């Protein structure tokens, strides 16, 4: 989970990154506990690796039987080293007091900064 002691200095696991995202999404509402809604972290490139180096990616979606296809509400990238969380279609950095507190805890464990992952962040295609 997200106790400081359970965060390895090598970074968040995929499961921990999802928990960070879930904290992030509480601040935006998004309705995570409604039937048909899911967060999916099984997003992979052709070699089975996360699509955006330095991050784990997650989709937020919804299946309604009156629809004919899945409806998607977000595609997110969560940094393994800082917990920085972006919605990478709208190119918005998620925020909120609870999320920032978690990120400071993650960074105190990994010893890494937002500046340390500047190149990887640029790889999200959301900032120059």
């Amino acid at each position: 989970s997200l106790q400081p002691a359970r965060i390895k200095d090598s970074g968040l696991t995929r499961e921990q990154a999802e928990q960070v995202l879930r904290v992030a999404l509480k601040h935006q509402d998004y309705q995570l506990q409604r039937p048909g809604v899911f967060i999916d972290g099984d997003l992979q490139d052709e070699n089975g690796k996360p699509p955006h180096p330095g991050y784990y990616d997650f989709s937020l979606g919804y299946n309604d039987p009156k629809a004919g296809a899945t409806e998607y509400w977000g595609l997110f990238s969560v940094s393994l080293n800082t917990g920085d969380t972006w919605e990478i279609n709208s190119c918005k950095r998620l925020d909120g007091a609870e999320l920032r507190a978690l990120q400071r805890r993650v960074m105190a464990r990994t010893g890494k900064s937002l500046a340390d992952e500047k190149s990887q962040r640029e790889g999200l295609g959301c900032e120059d």
Partner: protein, 141 residues
Amino acid sequence: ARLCNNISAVTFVSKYKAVCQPIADQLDLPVENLLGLAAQESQYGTGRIARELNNYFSMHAPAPLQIGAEAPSIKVAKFDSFQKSAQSFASSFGTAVRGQRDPMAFAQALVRSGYNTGNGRDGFARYLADIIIAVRGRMAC
């Protein structure tokens, strides 16, 4: 510039932009509208339903041209290829979205057709329209 730095996204757009063209033409749509929808549904080709089931439009089963179905309450279709999943979308929803070239109009027609019920900051249409515009730009990368 920035758009081209998302390698995953550029890879997806480069891979499938040409195969989307004739289907978009048949529906009187800019190709980016169709390819943008696939990018939305498949997380630029990284989602499991796309990778494993070739279902790049996350079509619920049963869908035309499907070769099988699998639960991800609701089953999703399996296809032979991206192209078949796009043809399936066209079969079920094409008449409803045809000629809706403006990205907002396209997204609104998608909702009217029942593809998504469609009902963060922006609403469903603006969010999808932004993906379509991003795809248009990534086609140049």
